[model samples]
Target: ADDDCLPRGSKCLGENKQCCKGTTCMFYANRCVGV
Candidate 1:
């Protein structure tokens, strides 16, 4: 996944997991925005 797709001030949940800020999730390339 593209690391740039994750929202600013957000962080990846885990390997292959979605990027999130608190409870908000972001998407990237049709999959969850992961680290």
Candidate 2:
């Protein structure tokens, strides 16, 4: 399962909140946002 995690504007799961570079997990949007 070599998923590339989530990128910007991508829907991300909670807890782990694992996102790609230059992006972060957002609680309000429940997605990855640019940092």
Candidate 3:
């Protein structure tokens, strides 16, 4: 499963990462946002 994420609730800090673990991409805020 190549979802492009570490895990749920995982924060990908430092620049725009690939994508959120389970949530959506939140590059601007440096985290993922629930839709």
Candidate 4:
């Protein structure tokens, strides 16, 4: 299930949501080197 709090295009990371590269919060996730 997808969480409403999570933004669209962002990958679901367990309990938290990580924005992919090209997004504003992409810096938060190390795995998001590029989108």
Best candidate (score: lDDT): 2
Measured against the true structure, the TM-scores of the candidates, in listed sequence, are 0.20, 0.49, 0.32, 0.20
Q: Rank all candidate structures by their TM-score, best first, as comma-separated numbers.
A: 2, 3, 1, 4
- Kindly report which residue pairs in candidate 1 clash with one another: none
Cα RMSD for candidate 3?
4.3
What is the per-residue lDDT of model 3 for residues 1-35, given as tens digits with 9 covering 90 to 100? 34565344666566445654446755555665565
* Clash numbers, per candidate: 0, 0, 0, 0
- Please report, as a residue range, the 10-residue window in candidate 2 with the lowest summed lDDT: 1-10
Q: How close is candidate 2 to the true structure, as a TM-score?
A: 0.49
| Residue 10 in candidate 2, Cα distance off native in Å | 2.1
Better of 2 and 4 by lDDT: 2
What clash pairs does model 3 have? none
Cα lDDT computed for each candidate against the true fold: 0.44, 0.67, 0.55, 0.41
Model 4 CA lDDT for position 30: 28
The TM-score measured for candidate 3 stands at 0.32
Position 20, candidate 2: lDDT: 64
Q: After superposition, how far is residue 28 of candidate 3 from its true place, in Å?
A: 1.7
- Candidate 2 residues lying further than 4 Å off, grouped into runs, are 1-4, 13-15
Tens digit per residue, CA lDDT, model 2, 1-35: 33356766677555464766666788778887777
Error of 2 at 12 (Å): 2.1
